[PDB]
Amino acid sequence: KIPRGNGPYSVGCTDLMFDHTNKGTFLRLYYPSQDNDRLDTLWIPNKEYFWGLSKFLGTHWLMGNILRLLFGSMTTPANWNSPLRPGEKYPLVVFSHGLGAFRTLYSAIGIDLASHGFIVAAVEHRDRSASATYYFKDQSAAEIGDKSWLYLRTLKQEEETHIRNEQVRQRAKECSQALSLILDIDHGKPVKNALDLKFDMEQLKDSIDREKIAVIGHSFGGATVIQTLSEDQRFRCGIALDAWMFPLGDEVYSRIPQPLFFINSEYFQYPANIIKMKKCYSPDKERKMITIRGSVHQNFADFTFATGKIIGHMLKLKGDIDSNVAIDLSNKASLAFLQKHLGLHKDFDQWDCLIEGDDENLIPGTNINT
Ligand SMILES: CCN(CC)CCN(C[C@]12C[C@](c3ccc(C(F)(F)F)cc3)(C1)C2)C(=O)Cn1c(SCc2ccc(F)cc2)nc(=O)c2c1C=CC2
Ligand SMILES: [Cl-]
Ligand SMILES: [Cl-]
16 A cells, blocks of 8 residues: 555664653654565554544544554555664654654655665654654653553644744754754664664664755644754755645744755645745755645645545545655655755766656646745
């Protein structure tokens, strides 16, 4: 269902939580793998994520059990806990999920990046923007595996502006903290994974190309990309996938020195949002924008592959365009942009035309009038 990566490398996957608290880092790692004979990765790994999704969709908790029945055994094509492919320093992408999502729902992107030689750290935010997430109250709880769950916060109309901005700021701090953790692991720092999994983090020592770091994200995660870039210069460039610009404070628009690429869906965008994207532009800064023809907001997330065409188009999970075609365009254009602004010595420049929207299923810039 969820597509395999298009690159030459097999892909592995694991989870890392450090420290064990609600202030620690929680991420799902996708990486180039040595082996390809392991069990596939469980897509949504706990029942509480389904209860969280039901609250996010506005239905009763019992609908969560129905979602669990339909999707609870589904996997994604990544070798769970497989050894890292040795003998090469890989560039790093930190990925930020949308409102109501969590770390595991962008594996199509994560797996494809990893298949082309990236390590991808998909963060799980503890700002109450995730449908659900978990942590451990103290050291004892972590030992026995007694999880404390944190669910999505519903906002009153009056809370919107202030709380969304507090959330995007926390999200940015979580992205920076995840980077610092991965870089420390790269420089041999011993870390006790709060989750007891058969993947030794010592394998990641000397595995990261420390200057080739990017941040990518969808919707609320797209705003997170921009906030993160403005406050952490260790990130060399960013790619915002159908960014939702509402959470950003007025101050961030003029302080994004890094190259920034907006990849939009045809049907999600609107003038107020496009105007905010245009405020990030300046003659001295590198900016690109493309729109995928026939695509919808959900083409960037994994649920676009989870159902058939009829049920998909009804639930707003698919657009007029084929989902595999849409994600290939976003992923290939992303690789070209990454090679250019991280200075990679790969063949991703074969997709440079996609950065300019030069393709039958792409629109240069945007279809929205402002
Ligand atoms: C309807 C409730 N309503 C108010 C909260 C709107 C909810 N909504 C549209 C939805 C996602 C939808 C969805 C999922 C999952 C099934 C399922 F049944 F297949 F599981 C069906 C139908 C429900 C389409 C969005 O919020 C869209 N959105 C997203 S969606 C990110 C996401 C979340 C969960 C996922 F499973 C996959 C992807 N991330 C953002 O950062 C922003 C926005 C809007 C502005 C900022
Ligand atoms: Cl849409
Ligand atoms: Cl508008």
